[PDB]
């Protein structure tokens, strides 16, 4: 699964994304080079994964 | 809360039910026996 974490529309617009039971290699493999279900990719760069 | 190191309890001891620092999980003797006894399924580990 995939989930989003937000502080509230009014509060801010900075969000986090969680890949459930999935660790941080295949998520890099989910880079926009291969198009998976979540079209948006700007955060796959990471820098805080 | 944290239990005091000295077990001065009028002779009423509790070690078996008290947590064990030796075990990787600070569990009671009895509760360790319970977990061992249960043939648990769906362990819910990361797997791969
Ligand atoms: C709870 O009751 C026990 C005994 O009434 C208190 O001390 C415990 O005494 C027994 C018998 O000495 C110990 O069991 C085994 O004794 C043999 C004797 O050779 C020893 O070689 C073994 O290594 C083992 O110790 C026992 O270790 C000892 N401690 C416990 C937790 O049972 C005890 O102080 C009372 N209080 C608590 C918190 O248990
Ligand atoms: C109260 O708790 C303390 C600590 O467990 C113990 O006090 C002992 O009392 C006797 C006198 O009756 C002294 O000779 C001991 O030196 C004390 N032990 C310690 C470690 O200080 C005892 O378990 C309990 N009873 C009393 C009176 O203190
Ligand atoms: C965001 O905060 C302001 C004031 O704190 C409030 O007026 C507004 O209703 C909030 N936006 C919501 C609940 O969508």
UniProtKB/Swiss-Prot annotation, chain A:
Q: Where is this region: Disordered?
A: 28-47
Glyco sites are at: 10, 23
Assembly: Binds to host ACE2. RBD also interacts with the N-linked glycan on 'Asn-90' of ACE2. Cleavage of S generates a polybasic C-terminal sequence on S1 that binds to host Neuropilin-1 (NRP1) and Neuropilin-2 (NRP2) receptors. Interacts with host integrin alpha-5/beta-1 (ITGA5:ITGB1) and with ACE2 in complex with integrin alpha-5/beta-1 (ITGA5:ITGB1). May interact via cytoplasmic c-terminus with M protein. May interact (via N-terminus) with host bilirubin and biliverdin, thereby preventing antibody binding to the SARS-CoV-2 spike NTD via an allosteric mechanism.
Function, as annotated, reads:
Attaches the virion to the cell membrane by interacting with host receptor, initiating the infection. The major receptor is host ACE2. When S2/S2' has been cleaved, binding to the receptor triggers direct fusion at the cell membrane. When S2/S2' has not been cleaved, binding to the receptor results in internalization of the virus by endocytosis using host TFRC and GRM2 and leading to fusion of the virion membrane with the host endosomal membrane. Alternatively, may use NRP1/NRP2 and integrin as entry receptors.
Full protein name: Spike protein S1
């Amino acid at each position: 699964g995939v989930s989003v974490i937000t502080p509230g529309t009014n509060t801010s617009n900075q969000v986090a994304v969680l890949y459930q039971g999935v660790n941080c290699t295949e998520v890099p493999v989910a880079i926009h080079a291969d198009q998976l279900t979540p079209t948006w990719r700007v955060y796959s760069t990471g820098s805080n994964v | 809360y944290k239990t005091p190191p000295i077990k001065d309890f009028g002779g009423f001891n509790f070690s078996q039910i008290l947590p064990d620092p030796s075990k990787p999980s600070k569990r009671s003797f009895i509760e360790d026996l319970l977990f061992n006894k249960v043939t648990l399924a769906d362990a819910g580990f990361i797997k791969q």
